[PDB]
Symmetry: C3
Subunit: 107 residues, 3 copies
């Protein structure tokens, strides 16, 4: 059970909302698990959009669905990347985002 990628970065939009993301990749024999962790202390009225690093973009793009369904305490999000820009869309406005994670396992 080896970790082959473990990166973290802070993204911010133009309205001053900020998120921290962590991308982790693990090998488990025949399987690989990829996990995205997300944290913000801010509220979100609508989608969060910000430039992501190339390594984070590459990680995000690799998902079989091409996006990441993610549960936060007060609502549901989908994280995607397009031309190096990360978007997190939310199911309802969130007074506070808090933390969540989203993973897939593949062989």
């Amino acid at each position: 059970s080896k970790t082959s990628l473990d990166i973290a970065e802070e993204l911010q939009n133009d309205k001053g909302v900020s998120f921290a993301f962590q991308a982790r990749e693990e090998e488990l024999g025949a399987f690989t698990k990829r996990t995205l962790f997300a944290y913000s202390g801010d509220g979100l009225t609508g989608p969060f959009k910000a430039p992501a690093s190339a390594e984070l973009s590459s990680f995000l793009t690799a998902h079989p669905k091409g996006r990441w369904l993610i549960a936060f305490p007060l609502g549901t999000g989908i994280v995607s990347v397009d031309e190096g820009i990360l978007t997190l869309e939310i199911s309802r406005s969130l007074p506070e985002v808090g933390s969540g994670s989203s993973f897939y396992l593949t062989e």
Copy 2:
């Protein structure tokens, strides 16, 4: 901290739905944590049933409640095993399952 077990396997039901499960055991001094991770890209209309490996079955049986309450983004499930058949029951039909985990800690 030390990991004594970390296994993964893919299960499929008769109607084409597939889940990946990872079972992890960690020792934290006097405590042991056991975590089940579950992922499916598919939707679930009703309960998911499929044969589990002996090692996964033994892991799932060890829970103090004899089953695993698990949150997915769009609803709640309960994972149990009976005679080596894993069943995941869900609180509502799910257009997409996504990922979730369920753990317990014991002394």
Copy 3:
């Protein structure tokens, strides 16, 4: 680099039992702190119990001063005041189950 990984069991005056695990990890310029919580019990109202010195300072260190946490059937907020942990819940919970709350900081 895991720089902290502690676990303890807490019980209230009504025999509800919780296990907590506090983990701190270092990822380059970032620190991640995760609180894991588990109870097999139901919870009618807030859970209060004394926490270790180490668990208390870990819980105090959050930028919001409290930990928003998702469980399968409802939402909680974990906080500490003078070594007493409180977990407040958004609705009564027939069973608590497991959840975790983390933050990532530069």
